[PDB]
């Protein structure tokens, strides 16, 4: 029940070990989810899921640095279904972002930002509700 758009704040930056915490439930007639992990204005960690493609569903990764997107990432394989709960997980380790939704390994993506500790916020948007959005060590 918290309000979408959501901005979680990450004190003092990401730090490998941090493990993001996300439940909600896919809105029907769902467009897109996106989780943004900001530095400032740039956007290190974009995951946006985007349930028609084209008439596909597909996830897109990147990053925007100064206003402008980079190379996407895409990954083909869809965990999330229109109408449902779901849980996305976020391990942040040395190398990359690590996500797992409904407790299976979805995709990686490699640091571009590497000021790790600058990486001060999340915002959660799109076609969700909302039902926890919390952080912890591992």
């Given at each position: 029940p918290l309000i979408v758009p959501y901005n979680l704040p990450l004190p003092g930056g990401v730090v490998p070990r941090m493990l993001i915490t996300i439940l909600g439930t896919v809105k029907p007639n769902a467009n897109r989810i996106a989780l943004d992990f900001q530095r400032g204005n740039d956007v290190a960690f974009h995951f946006n899921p985007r349930f028609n493609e084209n008439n596909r569903r597909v996830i897109v990764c990147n990053t925007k640095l100064d206003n402008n997107w980079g190379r996407e990432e895409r990954q083909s394989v869809f965990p999330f279904e229109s109408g449902k709960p779901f849980k996305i997980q976020v391990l942040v380790e040395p190398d990359h972002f690590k996500v797992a939704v409904n407790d299976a390994h979805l995709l990686q993506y490699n640091h571009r930002?590497?000021?790790?500790?600058?990486?001060?916020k999340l915002g959660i948007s799109g076609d969700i509700d909302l039902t926890s959005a919390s952080y912890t060590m591992i």
């Amino acid at each position: 029940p918290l309000i979408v758009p959501y901005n979680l704040p990450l004190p003092g930056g990401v730090v490998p070990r941090m493990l993001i915490t996300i439940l909600g439930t896919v809105k029907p007639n769902a467009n897109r989810i996106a989780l943004d992990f900001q530095r400032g204005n740039d956007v290190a960690f974009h995951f946006n899921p985007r349930f028609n493609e084209n008439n596909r569903r597909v996830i897109v990764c990147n990053t925007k640095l100064d206003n402008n997107w980079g190379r996407e990432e895409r990954q083909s394989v869809f965990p999330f279904e229109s109408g449902k709960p779901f849980k996305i997980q976020v391990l942040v380790e040395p190398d990359h972002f690590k996500v797992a939704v409904n407790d299976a390994h979805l995709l990686q993506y490699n640091h571009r930002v590497k000021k790790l500790n600058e990486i001060s916020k999340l915002g959660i948007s799109g076609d969700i509700d909302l039902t926890s959005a919390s952080y912890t060590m591992i």
